[PDB]
Amino acid sequence: AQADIALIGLAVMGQNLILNMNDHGFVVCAFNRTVSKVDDFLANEAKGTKVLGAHSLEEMVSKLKKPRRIILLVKAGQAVDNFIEKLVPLLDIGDIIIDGGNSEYRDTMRRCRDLKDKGILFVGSGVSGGEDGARYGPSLMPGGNKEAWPHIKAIFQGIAAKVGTGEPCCDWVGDDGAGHFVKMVHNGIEYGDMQLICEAYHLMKDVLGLGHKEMAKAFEEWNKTELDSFLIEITASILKFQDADGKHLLPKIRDSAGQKGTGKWTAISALEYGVPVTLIGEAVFARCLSSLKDERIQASKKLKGPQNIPFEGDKKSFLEDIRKALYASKIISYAQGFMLLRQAATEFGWTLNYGGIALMWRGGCIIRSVFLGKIKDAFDRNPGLQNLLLDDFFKSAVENCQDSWRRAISTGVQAGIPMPCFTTALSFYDGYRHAMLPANLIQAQRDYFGAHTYELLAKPGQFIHTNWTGHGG
Amino acid sequence: AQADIALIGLAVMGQNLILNMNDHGFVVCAFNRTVSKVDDFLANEAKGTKVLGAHSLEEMVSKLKKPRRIILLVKAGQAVDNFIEKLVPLLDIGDIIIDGGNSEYRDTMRRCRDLKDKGILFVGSGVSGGEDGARYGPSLMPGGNKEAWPHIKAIFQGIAAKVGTGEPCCDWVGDDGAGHFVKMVHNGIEYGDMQLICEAYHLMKDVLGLGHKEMAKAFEEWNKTELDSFLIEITASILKFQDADGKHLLPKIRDSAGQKGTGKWTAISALEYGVPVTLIGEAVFARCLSSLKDERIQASKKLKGPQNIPFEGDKKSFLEDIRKALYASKIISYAQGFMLLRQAATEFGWTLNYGGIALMWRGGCIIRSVFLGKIKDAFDRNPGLQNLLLDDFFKSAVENCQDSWRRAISTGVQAGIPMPCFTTALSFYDGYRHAMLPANLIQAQRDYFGAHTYELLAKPGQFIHTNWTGHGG
Ligand SMILES: Nc1ncnc2c1ncn2[C@@H]1O[C@H](CO)[C@@H](O)[C@H]1OP(=O)(O)O
Numbered sequence: 018a019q020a021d022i023a024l025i026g027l028a029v030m031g032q033n034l035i036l037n038m039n040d041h042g043f044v045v046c047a048f049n050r051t052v053s054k055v056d057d058f059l060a061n062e063a064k065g066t067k068v069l070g071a072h073s074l075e076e077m078v079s080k081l082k083k084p085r086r087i088i089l090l091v092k093a094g095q096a097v098d099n100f101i102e103k104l105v106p107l108l109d110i111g112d113i114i115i116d117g118g119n120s121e122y123r124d125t126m127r128r129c130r131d132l133k134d135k136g137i138l139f140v141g142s143g144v145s146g147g148e149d150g151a152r153y154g155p156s157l158m159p160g161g162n163k164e165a166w167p168h169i170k171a172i173f174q175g176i177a178a179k180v181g182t183g184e185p186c187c188d189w190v191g192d193d194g195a196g197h198f199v200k201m202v203h204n205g206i207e208y209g210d211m212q213l214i215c216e217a218y219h220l221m222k223d224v225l226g227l228g229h230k231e232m233a234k235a236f237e238e239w240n241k242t243e244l245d246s247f248l249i250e251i252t253a254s255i256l257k258f259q260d261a262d263g264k265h266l267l268p269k270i271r272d273s274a275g276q277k278g279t280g281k282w283t284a285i286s287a288l289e290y291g292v293p294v295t296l297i298g299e300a301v302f303a304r305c306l307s308s309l310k311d312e313r314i315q316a317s318k319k320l321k322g323p324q325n326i327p328f329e330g331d332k333k334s335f336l337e338d339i340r341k342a343l344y345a346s347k348i349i350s351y352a353q354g355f356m357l358l359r360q361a362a363t364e365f366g367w368t369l370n371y372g373g374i375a376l377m378w379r380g381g382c383i384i385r386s387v388f389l390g391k392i393k394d395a396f397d398r399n400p401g402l403q404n405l406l407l408d409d410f411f412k413s414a415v416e417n418c419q420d421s422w423r424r425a426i427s428t429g430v431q432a433g434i435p436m437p438c439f440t441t442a443l444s445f446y447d448g449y450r451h452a453m454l455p456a457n458l459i460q461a462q463r464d465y466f467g468a469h470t471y472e473l474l475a476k477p478g479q480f481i482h483t484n485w486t487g488h489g490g
Numbered sequence: 491a492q493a494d495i496a497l498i499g500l501a502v503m504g505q506n507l508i509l510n511m512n513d514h515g516f517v518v519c520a521f522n523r524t525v526s527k528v529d530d531f532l533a534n535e536a537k538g539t540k541v542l543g544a545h546s547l548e549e550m551v552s553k554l555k556k557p558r559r560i561i562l563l564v565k566a567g568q569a570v571d572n573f574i575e576k577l578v579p580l581l582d583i584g585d586i587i588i589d590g591g592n593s594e595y596r597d598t599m600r601r602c603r604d605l606k607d608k609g610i611l612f613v614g615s616g617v618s619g620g621e622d623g624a625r626y627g628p629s630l631m632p633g634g635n636k637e638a639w640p641h642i643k644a645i646f647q648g649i650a651a652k653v654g655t656g657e658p659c660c661d662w663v664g665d666d667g668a669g670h671f672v673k674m675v676h677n678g679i680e681y682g683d684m685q686l687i688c689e690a691y692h693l694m695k696d697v698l699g700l701g702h703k704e705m706a707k708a709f710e711e712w713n714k715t716e717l718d719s720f721l722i723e724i725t726a727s728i729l730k731f732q733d734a735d736g737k738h739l740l741p742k743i744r745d746s747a748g749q750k751g752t753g754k755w756t757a758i759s760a761l762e763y764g765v766p767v768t769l770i771g772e773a774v775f776a777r778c779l780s781s782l783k784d785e786r787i788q789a790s791k792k793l794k795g796p797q798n799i800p801f802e803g804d805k806k807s808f809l810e811d812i813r814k815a816l817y818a819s820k821i822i823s824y825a826q827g828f829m830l831l832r833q834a835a836t837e838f839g840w841t842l843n844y845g846g847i848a849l850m851w852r853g854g855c856i857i858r859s860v861f862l863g864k865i866k867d868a869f870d871r872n873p874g875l876q877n878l879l880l881d882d883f884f885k886s887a888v889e890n891c892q893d894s895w896r897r898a899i900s901t902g903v904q905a906g907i908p909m910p911c912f913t914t915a916l917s918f919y920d921g922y923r924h925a926m927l928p929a930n931l932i933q934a935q936r937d938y939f940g941a942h943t944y945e946l947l948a949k950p951g952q953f954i955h956t957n958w959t960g961h962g963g
């Protein structure tokens with residue numbers, strides 16, 4: 018009994034987190050499967066720190082103060098269960114296991130119940146910000162068994178990133194899967210935000226003909242307006258960056274976007290629960306499309322585009338319009354993001370604090386921005402808000418951005434620039450805005466070809482079946 | 491031994507199919523869980539037919555000739571397994587169970603293996619066309635254990651719908667889940683096609699101001715061009731239809747589109763396998779959006795649209811442009827549809843005949859059209875075709891439709907008409923066409939914030955990690 022908490026997982030993320038913990042005055046007993054890495058760590062990155070290193074799970078379990086708090090930061094699916102397998106022999110009733118890997122929300126749900134059943138408090142939390150984030154201030158998103166929360170509270174919130182008015186970007190999210198689900202809606206939104214920038218970039222590059230210096234300059238001006246955000250910032254950096262030969266490196270790298278499943282999963286949940294999260298879906302699908310790199314080289318030789326009409330208009334005005342389109346669209350993506358969180362709250366019965374979450378994403382994580390701030394006080398102003406687009410700030414920000422957004426999409430469309438996410442955003446906006454949508458023809462068709470029944474507009478609730486076929490005959 | 495085949499499931503679909511079978515000279519032993527319905531059937535719809543009716547599963551099993559062929563048309567998930575449970579006691583090695591319900595492709599895979607294991611040949615087939623389809627000519631899509639196929643061959647293909655040059659719209663699709671998967675990609679495409687028409691309809695209604703008579707007239711002209719298809723045909727009918735008070739009924743019915751999971755599932759599979767099936771996804775999401783009927787009535791009061799600019803242009807030209815937009819988009823949806831089938835062929839290792847499938851969808855089913863014909867001889871012309879957009883017919887049909895399609899989307903966008911599917915279609919087309927897409931910035935960002943590595947454009951295969959952060963400092 019001396020180590021406050023133990024962490025199993027000596028990858029960069031685990032090391033940088035153990036280190037941040039130590040720096041906040043917590044003694045950490047490090048453990049890892051290939052126990053050599055523990056020794057390596059102790060001699061190297063952890064030399065001179067207060068950290069203890071175990072060489073067996075039972076040693077690690079002995080070094081702990083009660084209630085035993087151990088953390089699993091094992092990149093995993095299977096591997097987490099196996100560790101849980103091992104640990105429960107060794108644990109007293111009331112001991113805590115936190116799982117920091119980006120797990121599947123349902124696995125977390127399962128695990129939490131099972132361990133609760135065997136007296137152990139399980140919490141799964143999303144950790145975000147990468148390795149430099151892990152080191153000095155991660156967003157942390159904990160969920161599972163709330164009994165554990167006062168016991169891990171101090172650590173989690175001390176190592177958490179802290180926003181301007183000193184609050185940690187870490188607070189308990191909710192029951193069983195809540196943290197892990199919140200975590201993966203986050204990565205979904207992250208996918209959305211990067212595709213929106215790729216599109217803004219494609220429009221400046223092919224329609225406006227800007228070279229990468231001017232383009233980087235534009236991204237920098239943008240990081241000083243409503244778009245003050247980490248991804249706009251590093252984008253200006255990436256565009257500026259010059260290689261060993263002094264030429265820009267972005268033109269050099271292969272356009273096949275990789276994935277590690279979390280964004281895919283956000284889109285799949287929307288589909289399962291019937292939540293119209295369209296930009297994230299479009300984003301996952303735009304990464305799928307770039308993977309067909311060979312196929313597009315082939316299609317370009319054969320499929321033809323619109324007649325080339327040079328951009329005839331002011332470049333500065335257009336650069337403005339793209340700013341406004343990227344922003345109005347970002348709003349729609351986030352609005353859809355929290356509709357997902359909302360529906361899952363009804364689905365699994367969790368009382369999520371949407372402003373709490375907005376705040377946990379305001380610092381630490383890759384999607385940090387001034388923007389999550391305005392989202393947070395939309396939900397402070399009204400925590401029962403049904404949809405972000407109805408909060409006056411956003412309601413007005415979109416209303417203002419509106420014909421710049423339409424003018425950016427019309428030119429892109431004319432010019433042949435692929436804009437999946439920019440167009441879904443307009444399509445969702447106009448969809449949601451309309452109190453009468455042609456979905457009644459879907460319904461009339463379905464009652465016709467497949468006997469499905471339909472409701473009248475006045476008298477919701479009663480279902481009718483008209484015999485269309487022949488109106489006599 | 492007298493009944494050629496047995497069918498368990500006396501719903502309208504089961505009755506109309508038993509009846510079609512009888513008419514092709516096959517003695518059918520009908521069975522159903524609530525055995526009263528068998529008696530009801532025999533006295534009523536089946537009076538004077540050659541059909542036999544059982545009153546117990548073991549009686550039904552006795553009435554059968556060997557190899558025993560029984561059909562499950564039980565609307566189900568669970569219920570099918572339970573019947574399989576019952577039936578295997580009663581069956582000899584080599585007996586066949588066909589499952590006609592719209593099952594989950596993975597359940598079918600499972601079931602096929604398990605029964606193959608116990609000597610029984612399982613085949614799951616999609617059945618399509620509804621009850622009037624079932625009666626006189628269903629599309630049938632069989633998959634599972636090919637040993638069973640010569641034994642059910644005659645029945646299935648005799649009752650199948652037959653296309654102009656006399657071939658049945660039924661041929662063996664492939665192993666284990668192939669039939670059931672082909673079936674559900676079909677319903678996905680069906681979703682796509684109806685949303686595209688709702689959009690064409692929304693543009694004629696709000697931009698062009700056409701009343702439902704003229705609108706119906708337009709749909710009828712369209713069913714006489716490249717768009718000769720059953721859904722264009724019944725749409726003209728639905729628009730014309732007048733209620734008991736002599737006013738049009740479509741304006742009367744509630745715009746909240748229902749779902750029964752199959753379209754949802756197509757979109758989810760695309761996401762799981764990384765296949766960019768975007769219109770179907772947009773379609774499922776446009777039905778999700780209409781379900782939020784109360785929410786849109788609320789949003790309409792608060793969210794504002796573009797400045798109302800009257801349509802200033804020729805109505806007839808625009809009606810043309812919408813024809814061309816609906817068509818170019820339909821092409822992109824189908825092209826994506828078969829990319830899904832293709833990837834599943836690589837995924838589960840089935841040798842699907844894409845022209846075979848195109849043909850099975852050419853008659854019978856709700857998506858029947860002259861269009862599936864041209865798709866079929868694209869794949870006859872080249873069965874190794876990687877993507878429908880590369881077949882000269884389509885390659886040219888899109889090239890022709892192209893600035894009508896762009897002009898329809900630009901006006902819709904300006905006017906505020908929600909067009910999810912029409913815009914994804916342009917976005918996928920321009921995406922696929924481009925041999926260089928901004929996905930390299932996604933990659934550069936990911937190597938920066940999350941150490942993910944990237945390939946150079948020349949030298950695919952080697953992965954680099956640049957330390958961006960500071961280029962010195
Ligand atoms: N199957 C497994 N069982 C337990 N831990 C594992 C594991 N697979 C991966 N991990 C751990 O996940 C962490 C990050 O990938 C590593 O510490 C790794 O342990 P290792 O050091 O033994 O590779």
Ligand SMILES: Nc1ncnc2c1ncn2[C@@H]1O[C@H](CO)[C@@H](O)[C@H]1OP(=O)(O)O
Nearest residue numbers: 499500501522523524527563564565569
């Ligand atoms: N749980 C169940 N077990 C077996 N058959 C079922 C069933 N649930 C639904 N079905 C059958 O599915 C068919 C179409 O819905 C019906 O014939 C129905 O039988 P029923 O006639 O007894 O309702």
